[PDB]
Amino acid sequence: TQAVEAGEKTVEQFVQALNKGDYNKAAEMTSKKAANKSALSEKEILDKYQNIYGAADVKGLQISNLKVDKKDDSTYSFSYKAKMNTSLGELKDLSYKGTLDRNDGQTTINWQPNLVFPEMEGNDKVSLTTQEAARGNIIDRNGEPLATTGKLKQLGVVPSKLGDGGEKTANIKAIASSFDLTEDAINQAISQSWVQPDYFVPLKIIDGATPELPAGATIQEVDGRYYPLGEAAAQLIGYVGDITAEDIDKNPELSSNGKIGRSGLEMAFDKDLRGTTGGKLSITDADGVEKKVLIEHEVQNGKDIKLTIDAKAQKTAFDSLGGKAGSTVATTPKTGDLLALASSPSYDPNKMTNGISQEDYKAYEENPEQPFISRFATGYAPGSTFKMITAAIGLDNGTIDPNEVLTINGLKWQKDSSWGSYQVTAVSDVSQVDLKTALIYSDNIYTAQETLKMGEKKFRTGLDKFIFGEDLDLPISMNPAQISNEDSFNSDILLADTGYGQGELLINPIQQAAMYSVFANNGTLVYPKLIADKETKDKKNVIGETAVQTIVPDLREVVQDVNGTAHSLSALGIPLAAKTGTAEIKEKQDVKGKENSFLFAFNPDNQGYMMVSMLENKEDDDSATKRASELLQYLNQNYQ
Numbered sequence: 001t002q003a004v005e006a007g008e009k010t011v012e013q014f015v016q017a018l019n020k021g022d023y024n025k026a027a028e029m030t031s032k033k034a035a036n037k038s039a040l041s042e043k044e045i046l047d048k049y050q051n052i053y054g055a056a057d058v059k060g061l062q063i064s065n066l067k068v069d070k071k072d073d074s075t076y077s078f079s080y081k082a083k084m085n086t087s088l089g090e091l092k093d094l095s096y097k098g099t100l101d102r103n104d105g106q107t108t109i110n111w112q113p114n115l116v117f118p119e120m121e122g123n124d125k126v127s128l129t130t131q132e133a134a135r136g137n138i139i140d141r142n143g144e145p146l147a148t149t150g151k152l153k154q155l156g157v158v159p160s161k162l163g164d165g166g167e168k169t170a171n172i173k174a175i176a177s178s179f180d181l182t183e184d185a186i187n188q189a190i191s192q193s194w195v196q197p198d199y200f201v202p203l204k205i206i207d208g209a210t211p212e213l214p215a216g217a218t219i220q221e222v223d224g225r226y227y228p229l230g231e232a233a234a235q236l237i238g239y240v241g242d243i244t245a246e247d248i249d250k251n252p253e254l255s256s257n258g259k260i261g262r263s264g265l266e267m268a269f270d271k272d273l274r275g276t277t278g279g280k281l282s283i284t285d286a287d288g289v290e291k292k293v294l295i296e297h298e299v300q301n302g303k304d305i306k307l308t309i310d311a312k313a314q315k316t317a318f319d320s321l322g323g324k325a326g327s328t329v330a331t332t333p334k335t336g337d338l339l340a341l342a343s344s345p346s347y348d349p350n351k352m353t354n355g356i357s358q359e360d361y362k363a364y365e366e367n368p369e370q371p372f373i374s375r376f377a378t379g380y381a382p383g384s385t386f387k388m389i390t391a392a393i394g395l396d397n398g399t400i401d402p403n404e405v406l407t408i409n410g411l412k413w414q415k416d417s418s419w420g421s422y423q424v425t426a427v428s429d430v431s432q433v434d435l436k437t438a439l440i441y442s443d444n445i446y447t448a449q450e451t452l453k454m455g456e457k458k459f460r461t462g463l464d465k466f467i468f469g470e471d472l473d474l475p476i477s478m479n480p481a482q483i484s485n486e487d488s489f490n491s492d493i494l495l496a497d498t499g500y501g502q503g504e505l506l507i508n509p510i511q512q513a514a515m516y517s518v519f520a521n522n523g524t525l526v527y528p529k530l531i532a533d534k535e536t537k538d539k540k541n542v543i544g545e546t547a548v549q550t551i552v553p554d555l556r557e558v559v560q561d562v563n564g565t566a567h568s569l570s571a572l573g574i575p576l577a578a579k580t581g582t583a584e585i586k587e588k589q590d591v592k593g594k595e596n597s598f599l600f601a602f603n604p605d606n607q608g609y610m611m612v613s614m615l616e617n618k619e620d621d622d623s624a625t626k627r628a629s630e631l632l633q634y635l636n637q638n639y640q
């Protein structure tokens, strides 16, 4: 019995050393190379475990149902079920047999070929044939392609088959003249540090007919991932990259020759898009004739992914940002379909996945405007657009009378002398300010006074009915919106700032589109949705229908009133309700404060579309409002 317990520890450590990928430590727990003992030496056990388990990408060996007893004076038998992960799938239900040995005080494993796979005998080999799975496509709500896979002919020259003296110069000139490439660039590539005589130095990417090939040039067809919208959806869609040996160690079910999603939806839906590797893992005899099969799946290509995105709206939303720092979110607010998720500046995903120079990659990473950031998922202070939420809360809890006219003297205001030098500031000197006026001119003082009058308790009570702190059900990495840093403002100043969208508020554009959706659904919050087939989910009674019917007519006046901050959008001649905002930020360099321009706009007649556009670190006279004319026209015509 005391010996049977030591054997269950030996089988445990032997399996553990195999599981931990240390095939040498497991080899030293075996007996000597002899009959009725170990079949091979230790160096041959290492090389057999390394060759076979390495070829099958064997990872995560775990056993169960261990049964160890006694067979003779020095012989102990052991059995167990086992399972392991391979590049083909899960290899479960493995009945392992063996015998232990107690020669001195230690117990060793009489190693046999049946301890690599159950039915191996003598000089049996292992064979693995695999078929790569085609990565699925990504498409928009109307079927247009967003990310597809295909073949790409790649021109390239062989330095050895190019020439010696003069003939190499002649072949370079013929390759240059027959492929439209400068002669100074062909020599710059074939002379790089990595190049060797008999290598394949790629040049151009043939996108049409293959022309006449001079001496030295040769086309090598390769697989590529194409992105039709390109940079206009690079943050959302992401890009794929060549699978590395580290990736295979983490998930053996990958193809060491395929691509893996690195960011965005390409990485988010990597499992669904990449498919499953097909093939067969068999045990052959000593000559290569197949005996027993261990795994066999057929190649199953990846699934396609259909998004709520509109390819036209996505490209228009991105183009309207003119390459400046910003982002635009367009939805159908009654269902939550995300029509566009643009971020700017961006990077070339085609260039990123189909070969990018190391200089260009550093440009993308050293760019201060940071093109790799998904700005529709970055938290910001919403600014003056947030007054709609504060107003709706003040109307619901009976704090704001729409017709009551506050008197506001001057452009500065503070509650009392305890505020020191801090004062809420108004841009327009309007003395008689009611709710409709405060939304048209965007008056901070009215909002600050009504927030302080409301109280912190009643303010948060209305705020907590929204999606602050919630994690949206979206395949986009994202932080939840927050009201402040802590559960209490503990400051009348901070309570006031939060009233008109400043303070410690952090709400990303997508979360803003979800929160502002209440004004298109009579106070019901409709959650955003990116997968076209998902079910619409909502959250009712977030604000009162009374507040919606009061505020939306005022938001029409933000566009229609001649002093409205969005009056430039009345040139469209379409039903629009809007609210602009400009948030000031002092979290970069103290040399100068930076401003973020915002625009919220939806159709108040049919509620077909909703838009939340942003400009980060805006230039002067530049706003989100002056750029939104084109996207609004498209959404108004195509989403009624």
Ligand SMILES: *C(=O)[C@@H](NC(=O)Cc1ccccc1)[C@@H]1N[C@@H](C(=O)O)C(C)(C)S1
Pocket: 383, 384, 385, 425, 427, 441, 442, 443, 444, 500, 501, 565, 579, 580, 581, 582, 583, 584, 595
């Ligand atoms: C809301 O965001 C308000 N903004 C400020 O009080 C800060 C600010 C920023 C730049 C210049 C002056 C003041 C108001 N809303 C914006 C807007 O709707 O664009 C105004 C510029 C009207 S102030």
